[PDB]
């Protein structure tokens, strides 16, 4: 009977909330007491990437903190250079609607998917120098929202359909299917050990998936609207979220609770991208009001503002060494801050 | 110069990637993008067949101009989370099944879709080429069963051209942005070869406004 199970579900969710409330000793705002403040952080643009000619929807740094990748609304995909300002490669895309990028940890592959429900993976370090499709991943029913790389042999994709998929490259089919969400899944971020990732849906819940087992471990409710951005703490024991509520939350993976709510009265625009800086002290956020922000982590006080664009900032991301940050907005210019 | 031999060649490579990127951006910018939306089984098949999973596009050319028809209506997702991907689209070809009024009625749902798409923040400047198809079925259905069931506000008589104009202005009066955009209504059926001519006439009229705005005459 439906009533013989919905009552049990409500009771078990109440037990979940009670168990959460029992383990909440002190809020992290009370724990970070009498602590040296970060102070205002000065952030100047170092490079400006003036190649694209349309709206930039995604971006991903490499592992050498040297190259970039961008997905503009045109049928192109530029693999930028960071210390200098040149273009390593330009990819003529098969579908102008693209919302995803993923740079290989070894730099040999780039993922690319959008509204076509197809994840196109592009081989870079190839004889007969040219960038060709390694595999055209098929098996999704909605638009693919974000791509991640475990290695050169695996890829984790989050799509509009209420599921996440872990793919294989030798055979282009899925190996696990994380079908546990409701609503469109918008963002995800892998872990330093690449064993767990959390996907963020439009039902305002983040679920911690287990790559090896293929089953969900924890669900993170308590957030208001649909969430569009997730990045882990560099320790891999916490993750931020970004919603259209104009509020960010820093959860944890060992208490399953909330630690900070990152909201301000003057901001009403939703968050589009979230990326921690190294050491986890900072929280960068890609807002919609033509502007970014850098929130301090241990105390939710806001650090220096980050405004260099005139349109919606879609994506941003810190390098793997913590050196630079590249904000890619809806205007065709990226901006590598420092 | 303070640049290496490989660095100068890298700058050369970047510069010609810029040139080949411009040679494609200028080519694609001249092409017209026409988003095609509507209701489920609202006659999109016959119209995508008339003018020559995910998003399925079409490239039909009339009077030497390359068009693009993005049929993203077969997506089955939250429309508000990918509708911002269609910034700068020249027009939105919206199609309403006229004869589907006596069929939980769904023209009210389509009207709610129209007033949510025309008043969207991303589609303020984009015009809507509103289509009204299955007029042959609508004519017979008006004579068979009265139309006043759907609209309690309707009070007119049993005239075909009267009812068609009534629902036309009912759909037209759904926008709160009465000046920033225009709605080009049309009546069409299967036995009509004038649809492509009408949409070309509308796209010429809207690119006239587009380039007048680009020069800042408006």
């Amino acid at each position, epitope marked *: 009977e439906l009533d013989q199970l919905r009552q049990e579900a409500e009771q078990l969710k109440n037990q979940i909330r009670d168990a959460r409330k029992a383990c909440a000793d002190a809020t992290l705002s009370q724990i970070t007491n009498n602590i040296d403040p970060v102070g205002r952080i000065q952030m100047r643009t170092r490079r400006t990437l003036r190649g694209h000619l349309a709206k930039i929807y995604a971006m991903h740094w490499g592992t050498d903190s*040297r*190259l970039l990748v961008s997905a503009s609304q045109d049928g192109k995909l530029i693999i930028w*250079d960071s210390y200098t300002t*040149n273009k*390593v*490669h330009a990819i003529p895309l098969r579908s102008s609607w693209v919302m995803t990028c993923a740079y290989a940890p070894s*730099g040999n592959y780039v993922a690319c998917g959008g509204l076509d429900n197809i994840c196109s993976i592009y081989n870079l*370090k190839t*004889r*007969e*120098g*040219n960038v060709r499709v390694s595999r055209e991943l098929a098996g999704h029913t909605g638009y693919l929202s974000c791509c991640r790389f475990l290695d050169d042999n695996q890829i984790v994709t989050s799509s509009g359909d209420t599921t996440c998929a872990l793919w294989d490259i030798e055979t282009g089919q899925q190996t696990t299917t994380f079908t546990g969400h409701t609503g469109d899944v918008m963002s995800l971020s892998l872990a330093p050990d690449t064993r767990l990732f959390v996907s963020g849906a439009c039902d305002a819940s983040a679920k911690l998936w287990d790559v090896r087992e293929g089953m969900c471990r924890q669900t993170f409710t308590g957030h208001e609207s649909d969430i569009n951005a997730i990045c882990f703490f560099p320790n891999g024991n916490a993750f931020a979220t970004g919603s259209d509520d104009a509020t960010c939350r820093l959860f944890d993976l060992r208490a399953d609770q909330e630690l900070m709510t990152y909201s301000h009265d003057n901001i009403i625009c939703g968050i589009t991208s979230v990326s921690f800086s190294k050491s986890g002290r900072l929280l960068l956020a890609g807002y919609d009001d033509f502007n970014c922000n850098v929130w301090d982590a241990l105390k939710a006080d806001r650090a220096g503002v980050l405004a260099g664009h005139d349109n919606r900032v879609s994506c941003l991301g810190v390098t793997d060494d913590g050196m630079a940050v590249a904000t890619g907005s809806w205007d065709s210019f990226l901006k590598i801050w420092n | 110069c*303070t*640049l*290496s*031999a*490989e*660095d*100068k*060649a*890298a700058v*050369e*490579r970047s*510069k*010609m990637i810029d040139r080949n990127l411009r040679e494609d951006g200028e080519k694609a910018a001249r092409e017209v993008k026409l988003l095609l939306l509507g209701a489920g089984e609202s006659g999109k098949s016959t119209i995508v067949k008339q003018m020559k999973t995910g998003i399925v596009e079409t490239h039909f050319t009339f009077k030497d101009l390359h068009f693009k028809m993005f049929d993203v209506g077969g997506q089955r997702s939250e429309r508000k989370k990918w509708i911002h991907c269609f910034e700068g689209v020249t027009a939105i070809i919206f199609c309403v099944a006229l004869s589907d009024y006596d069929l939980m009625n769904r023209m009210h749902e389509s009207m709610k879709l129209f007033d949510s798409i025309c008043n969207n923040k991303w589609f303020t400047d984009t015009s809507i080429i509103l289509f009204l198809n299955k007029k042959d079925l609508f004519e017979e259905k008006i004579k068979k069963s009265p139309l006043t069931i759907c609209y309690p506000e309707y009070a007119g008589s049993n005239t075909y051209e009267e009812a068609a104009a009534y629902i036309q202005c009912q759909f037209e009066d759904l926008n709160k942005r009465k000046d920033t955009k225009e709605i080009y209504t049309h009546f069409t059926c299967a036995t009509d070869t004038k649809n492509v001519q009408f949409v070309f006439d509308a796209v010429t009229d809207v690119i006239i406004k587009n380039n007048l705005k680009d020069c800042g005459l408006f």
Partner: single-chain antibody
Amino acid sequence: VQLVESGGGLVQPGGSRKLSCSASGFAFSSFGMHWVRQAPEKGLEWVAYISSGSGTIYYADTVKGRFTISRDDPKNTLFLQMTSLRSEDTAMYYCVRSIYYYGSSPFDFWGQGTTLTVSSSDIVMTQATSSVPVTPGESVSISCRSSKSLLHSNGNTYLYWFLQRPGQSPQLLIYRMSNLASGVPDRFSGSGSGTAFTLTISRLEAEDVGVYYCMQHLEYPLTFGAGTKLEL
């Protein structure tokens, strides 16, 4: 894949000939083609260069202005016309593929070469190792030396390495200092500092026998080094 080059033969001095190769198997329009010659009993000698789309054309001091080079992207071919051939121009002319982006492998593929026989302030790469005997399973550190600090201010050093088996086209080994081109075993590991470089082989088999030339790419005209004959 292959770069077959055609032209040359028994020629008389002064005669003008066109050396052409037909590229087949890559994006010829995206590769900056080169032209490297080798005298019948001497080392390599740079000749010319064309960037992608014929944007940049360079020549060596010997062939400066006297030879004309060009490319034809639609036909996937590379051209180089000689004028006033002299007896000091006999060589085997190799067509060298090269691409220049970050982390690329310039001078990766080398053509088979054409036989040319006509009857009748620079960087110097010093390497005196020649007729040196080698036994399989041993380790040989082929020394090298330049006349200019190849360590540019932009971090990396623009020194390459190449291998030439007896009777075959040259092959790239180490595309910077302390790198390794694709298709090369990890036996070869470069090690250099300033104007002193060595190609360290941890353990060598019986198939990697030949002559090892060094070549700077800091600035043109891309000087080479002498031969290094590893005798079995």
